[PDB]
Every structure is written in structure tokens, then in C-alpha cells.
Design a protein around this ligand. Structure first.
Ligand SMILES: O=S(=O)(CCCC(F)(F)F)Nc1ccc2cnccc2c1
Ligand SMILES: O=S(=O)(CCCC(F)(F)F)Nc1ccc2cnccc2c1
Ligand code: NA
Ligand code: NA
Lengths: 415, 415
């Protein structure tokens, strides 16, 4: 008689607020409406570094509204980028939540990132070489450490029931939400701010990722380069993003009159032990990740109406996920690959895509998967394309698969 | 009622093997004998970079046995230092546990770290500035990503029940152990490889932490510089380290004839939300990390015989920890500050001090806190000093407190 959300073994956890900054818009609800209208965030990069280095990739989605356009001189001096993004999203999230007065002792922050304050390592390196060890800021360490974002958000909001930073590359954002859920169901907290943040698009990131040969080079037509599950896909597209959601026990959200957006029912974490950067082709462990989220939710595969696919738009990546969705027996669910419109935000993407899974369940709609024009004959899923599909989505699984063979799956339900 | 290890709510988890590379020795058992003999791995740094920059800190503990002396030309070109450490310790641990055949679908890896593959960031940055984006390695991303060490260990040992990497600075190693324990009691695995790994001593690391005023500069007596809880303390000393342990359910241990070295009973994670690098002076949330560890273990503070303190030798750090142990009502316990001997491993250190906490319970002996000469009235603790302290220690807490206000306590028990 193992514990599940269904059988009361875990307390009921609800999502009571969300925030995201995006290539389409700084406002999640605008981003949502824009996705339903079939808008894409992916453009031709106009940054000088592109033409300075003659990079193979000249496309991506910068945030519609730069994080640093909201950051004064002080904040530019004492925070890394992911920190400054985290402070911004943290404040937006709380205001959206009605600036609630919670017990800081029962309040956790779990925010993942791909890399950390990496640019401050480079800057400290350059300053030290030009002028010696005393040119390194006494702030260098607090900005460089990859727990910086979560620590800045925790300090900002007064989270005293734990501040955590899981790192698993592309799945970091989803993993953070998994761990926030655990922290609540195990009794360590009643409310948790969780999600992901990531750095902007730049020369060195593109260089690194494009030399892996995992990126689309369809530079002629930016808006059509991201092609999850399409026969002509040639890898992923950068799409800057950041996302937090507020979760709390249903008791808690009720005690303060907060109207839930959805339920976070269960969470699955597994691994491939196959390759450092390529997903196991059989999708077996990735599927178990999904199956596990259902065990803890108390759901069976037949209950899943929707799947928010990883949808990297790599050849081997989409084939792998196809096999996973079959292995978990969720292949009759309506699939959506939001990376088609928003692109890959690495450490942030798993949390943005959880925010879309929540809204999907709230509004009862899945936006269209852009650029799905020649479905891959070797992949037989129900990819939503063309126009938004209004459906009775009671339960969804959001997938995330990280470099290192990390598999995370989040089980969500309608309120 | 609430599930506690004592009341059978969580399955009994056991430590069945351990491994560490330290400044005293590559062989953990040799390190443990040297600590009881009163030895110190902190020597004067002979490194060129000391002289080139004339660093204020000229003292530190390199590994007795450098990682790269065991590493081929291909590994040196294909992995980040921390991965190379992770591979080496993963193999040593596996061998020490008798190379057991385990179900990969119930076998997790949780290895934390401080920074990640940082050297690959600067190197990639330098190569690209030199000869353009083509000069960045196709392996750059897997080497840089902080989850890289955890990944490599998971792939080397075939862990498929999840590979995870918590980053919480100085507490990363202890946090890795806390999540592996969770992974097991929530039922996601039966056997975990967990601990932490960290990069070597170098110019920028010393500049970075020096400039916070965090580090001891007592260069003329390197083996006396690290003075946890002592009146004349003046900051921490770098001591290179990596540490891993094998934990598993008692049931799983029994069934393969593995001899338990100790029990892992409970794990608390709290946060100060006080300051980015200063611990809260009151020690309340720190102590509540200890308290939480005992709730889950089913112990009362009165049952705690030993505490394996953070003991960084920072003036404000030790003060706060002393109050933390007072709030946890564990201030009756025989206290040890291993950093006195082995220095500060940052990411690794919690993993290391967790292993030393195991061997303390196994052998009924606490080593002496080196350089404890002038009791601080602000620290009213029973700090073990002078001669080892022998006794029937049944229950021990291992404290870690990271920059960013992350507090990890681990409840351990004699087998
Ligand atoms: O994976 S990353 O390299 C880029 C991700 C890009 C995008 F997908 F669009 F989000 N992460 C970071 C992290 C910190 C950085 C700080 N300064 C400059 C770039 C950074 C990129
Ligand atoms: O905290 S760190 O800066 C120094 C480690 C401290 C200690 F281990 F205790 F000595 N971490 C790293 C990480 C990666 C590195 C790769 N190459 C050079 C140095 C590195 C330091
Ligand atoms: Na997804
Ligand atoms: Na300790």
C-alpha cells in the first residue's frame, strides 16, 4: 500500500501562481496568447558577435524584454545574469501571488540553472590577468556559485525551509519543480517558489553547442528552423527564457484564498547510463521517468490526456522521445512541442514548459506545434499543429531530458 | 503519526563502503589513522602561481596523490578535472564494495560539486578569442556542465534510477548524501553512490575567496593556520578533497553480504535567508537543519553523542555554528572540526566530513581538532582537542553550512 496523491499518501499540492519571461513576451499570459495565435519568438540574430565570428548559427530568440533593462547600477554590480533574471522573476511571481505573508520557516526555493554565473568567472579571470589578485571583486564568489540564483530568490522572499539548485542541463528546470514537490510532500515546507533561469544567447554558447552539431543551421528562415517531430528537422534553436511557479499544499492555498491554476500530482527522475549527451534510442528509462510520475500521482497511462514533449528538434532526440512516450503507454495523448515556437532555454526550459502544461490544463487548450508540415514516417504521435486544440485535458505529463542522460517527468492535473 | 526511521516509516539505509582522496592520503583508512595520530595535510604551497601573483595566502593542502597521475592522454583531453576525480573515486568505491552486481534500474548517483568544469570555460573562452568558434571542443558542454561529474560516475557504474547534482557551495557534498537518502526512502532506488568532488587549489580560487577576507593568512606555520573554534582563528585553509560513499537499504545490504560501516538515519535541509556569504548570527535555521535531521531519524537531541561541525575557522562562521548547536540542543556532544587537519574542500567537504562521521561511529573514536589552544567564550562547546577522544558514540550529526545560507544536517547511527 505505497503512498500516492490519489490515495492521500502525499498531501495535495497545487500551483497558485506562475511567471515567465520569454522570446515572445515578458508576460506569461501574453506569451500564452501569442503561442495560441501561432506566433514564434525565433528571429535572425542582429547581435554584432554573429557577424564578428561568422558563426554557423545566426538565429535564436532573445527575450522580448531584456532582463537588464529593469536593473539599476547597484544590481548590475552585485549579481550575475541568472541572479538578475531570478530577482526579476522572483518579484513578479510574489506580486502575481498577492504578495502573501507566509511562514518563512515553511517556505522553500528550488531553482535550477544550466551553468551559473559563468560570465563572472571570465570577467574575474580577465581582471586578474590585467591587474592582479586584488582586481577580483570580493563579490566574485557569491555571483559565480551556481546556487546564486536560488540564494538571491530565497533571500529576496525570505525562504528559510531550504534553498536548492539541482543541475542536470536541459532537465534542471523540471528537476527543480520535482524537488520542490518532494520538499512539500515529505513535510519540510508547505509553500515553494520553484523553476529555472538561464543565461542569454552569446558567441561562446553558440560556438560550444554548434560544435556538438545539435543545433539547426536553417538560417534562411528563422521562424521555421525549430521542427520537432518533422522529417526535415536539423537540431534545436536557442530561445532565451526564465520561469518560476508558486506551489503550496491545497490546505495552505485555501487558508489564504489563493485560487489554484492546477495540481502537481507526482514527479519522476531516472537516468540512461548510455551517453553523456545523446539519449538512449529505446526511450525505456525516459518512459519509466513518466511511469514513475504516474505511480506517485496514482494515475494510470490511460488517464494522460496530454504530453508536453521535450521536442528538442534533434533527429535522434525526437526518435528517442517517441519511443519513451510509447514505453510509458501515453502515445494516445495529444502532444505539444513548445520548443517549436519558444526554442530551447536549457536550464529554464523544463520550468517554462511546466508553466505551459499548467495553463494547458487551466484553459483546456494546447497551442499548435509550429513547423510540423511533413510528419516523420518513423514517429506516430498525435502532435497538435495548425490551430489550438480545445480539449478536456484532466491530466498531463511534462517531459525534460538533460545532457548526461537525465530524465525528469512531472505529473500535472486540472483543478 | 509521522514516518521516522526509528518507527519503521522509512526503510533502514546503511553505509556499506566509503572512499576519499585527501591531502593526508589517497587511501581513506590511511587518512583516518593520520587524523587520530594528529597529522595535518596543510603544507606551504610550492606552486609557481603563489610567487607570480604574490598571493596573501601561501598555505594549502594539495592531494597527497594527484588525480591526473592516474589519467591517460585521452581522459585529460576528454574530461574536466572534477569528472576525472569522479571517475577515479567511482572505480575505487566500486572495488572497495566488492564490485557488486546491482539492478541498474534501482541504482542512483547523487554527487554534488561547488563550481563544475570551470577551467574548460576559460580555456574555451581563450581558444575562441585566439582562433574563432571552430577552436572550441565538441566536448566543451559535457566537460563544463556541473552535472558532468555525476553523469560520468553514473555512466561508469550504470546508475539508471536517477543521476542528480545539488549545488549549495560548501554544503554540496552533504546535500548530495541527503538527496540520495531521499531517493531511497521515497522508493526510487535501493542503492546509491553519493558524495562530492571539487577542483584543485589555484590562483583565481585563492584571489576570489581571499578578497572576501574568508581565508587564513598564517603562512609562517602552515600546519597551525586552520583553527576552528579557537580564539586566534583568522579564516579557512584550502584542503583539496573528493569523497564518495555507497549507501543502500539494510535489506539490499544483507542480501549481497555487504558489511555496514554505519546507518544513515535522517537528513535536514534549511536556509538562513539572511545574507549571501554571512551565516545568520543566531544559528536558529542552521540548528533547525540539525533538528529536522533528528525528527526524520526519530531521535531526540539528548540521544546525540557526537557532532562533526562545519568548523571553517572563520570568526563569524564558528560563532554562528556554536549558536546553531545550542538551538539544536546538541551542545552536550563531543565536537570535531576536521578542517583543522584536512582544510576546506568546498563541494567535497560535506561528503568527506560525512565519511569521517561514519568512521567515528564505526571505531568509537573522535580525532583531535588540531590547533585548538585558546577556548573562545563565544564558543561554549566540548571541542575534542589534544588526544583522540574514545567512547560509545551511538548517534552523530554531520553539519555543513554553504555560502548563500544553505544548511545541511545528516543524522548518522552506529551499526
Ligand atoms: O547554456 S548557456 O550557455 C546559454 C543558453 C542560451 C539560451 F538557451 F538562450 F538560454 N547558459 C549561459 C549561462 C550563463 C551565461 C552568462 N553570460 C552569457 C551567457 C551565458 C549562458
Ligand atoms: O572552489 S574552487 O574554486 C577551489 C577548490 C577548493 C579546494 F578544493 F578546496 F581546494 N573550485 C574549483 C573547481 C574547478 C577547478 C578547475 N581548475 C582549477 C581550479 C578549480 C577550482
Ligand atoms: Na516538455
Ligand atoms: Na562537518
Amino acid at each position: 500500500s505505497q503512498p500516492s496523491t490519489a490515495n492521500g499518501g502525499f498531501p495535495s499540492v497545487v500551483v497558485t501562481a506562475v511567471t515567465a519571461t520569454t522570446s515572445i513576451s515578458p508576460d506569461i499570459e501574453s506569451t500564452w496568447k501569442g503561442l495560441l495565435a501561432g506566433e514564434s519568438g525565433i528571429h535572425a540574430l542582429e547581435d554584432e558577435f554573429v557577424t564578428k565570428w561568422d558563426l554557423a548559427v545566426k538565429i535564436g530568440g532573445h527575450l522580448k524584454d531584456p532582463v537588464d533593462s529593469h536593473m539599476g547600477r547597484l544590481d548590475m554590480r552585485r549579481m550575475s545574469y541568472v541572479q538578475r533574471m531570478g530577482k526579476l522573476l522572483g518579484g513578479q511571481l510574489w506580486e502575481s501571488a498577492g504578495s502573501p505573508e507566509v511562514d518563512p520557516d515553511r517556505f522553500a526555493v528550488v531553482v535550477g540553472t544550466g551553468l551559473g554565473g559563468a560570465e563572472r568567472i571570465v570577467e574575474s579571470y580577465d581582471l586578474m590577468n590585467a591587474g592582479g589578485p586584488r582586481k577580483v571583486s570580493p563579490l566574485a564568489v557569491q555571483m559565480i556559485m551556481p546556487n546564486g540564483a536560488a540564494a538571491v530568490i530565497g533571500l529576496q522572499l525570505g525562504a528559510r525551509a531550504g534553498v536548492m539548485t539541482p543541475v542536470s542541463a536541459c532537465s534542471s528546470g523540471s528537476e527543480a519543480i520535482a524537488h520542490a514537490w518532494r520538499q512539500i510532500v515529505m513535510g519540510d515546507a508547505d509553500v515553494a517558489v520553484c523553476g529555472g533561469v538561464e543565461g542569454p544567447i552569446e558567441a561562446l554558447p553558440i560556438a560550444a553547442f554548434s560544435m556538438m552539431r545539435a543545433m539547426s543551421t536553417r538560417n534562411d528562415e528563422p521562424e521555421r528552423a525549430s521542427r520537432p517531430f518533422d522529417k526535415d528537422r536539423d537540431g534545436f534553436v536557442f530561445g532565451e527564457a526564465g520561469a518560476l511557479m508558486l506551489i503550496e499544499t491545497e490546505e495552505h492555498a485555501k487558508a489564504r484564498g489563493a485560487k489554484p491554476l492546477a495540481r502537481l500530482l507526482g514527479a519522476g527522475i531516472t537516468s540512461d547510463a548510455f551517453h553523456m549527451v545523446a539519449p538512449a534510442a529505446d526511450g525505456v528509462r525516459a518512459g519509466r521517468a513518466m511511469t514513475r510520475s504516474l505511480e506517485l500521482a496514482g494515475l494510470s497511462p490511460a488517464d494522460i490526456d496530454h504530453v508536453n514533449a521535450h521536442g528538442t528538434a534533434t533527429p535522434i532526440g525526437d526518435a528517442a522521445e517517441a519511443n519513451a512516450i510509447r514505453v510509458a503507454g501515453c502515445d494516445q495523448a495529444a502532444v505539444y512541442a513548445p520548443k517549436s515556437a519558444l526554442g530551447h532555454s536549457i536550464g529554464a526550459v523544463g520550468a517554462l514548459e511546466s508553466v505551459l502544461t499548467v495553463l494547458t490544463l487551466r484553459d483546456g487548450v494546447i497551442p499548435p506545434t509550429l513547423n510540423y508540415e511533413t510528419p516523420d514516417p518513423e514517429i506516430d504521435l498525435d502532435v497538435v499543429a495548425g490551430e489550438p486544440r480545445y480539449g478536456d485535458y484532466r491530466y498531463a505529463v511534462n517531459n525534460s531530458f538533460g545532457f548526461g542522460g537525465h530524465n525528469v517527468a512531472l505529473a500535472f492535473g486540472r483543478y
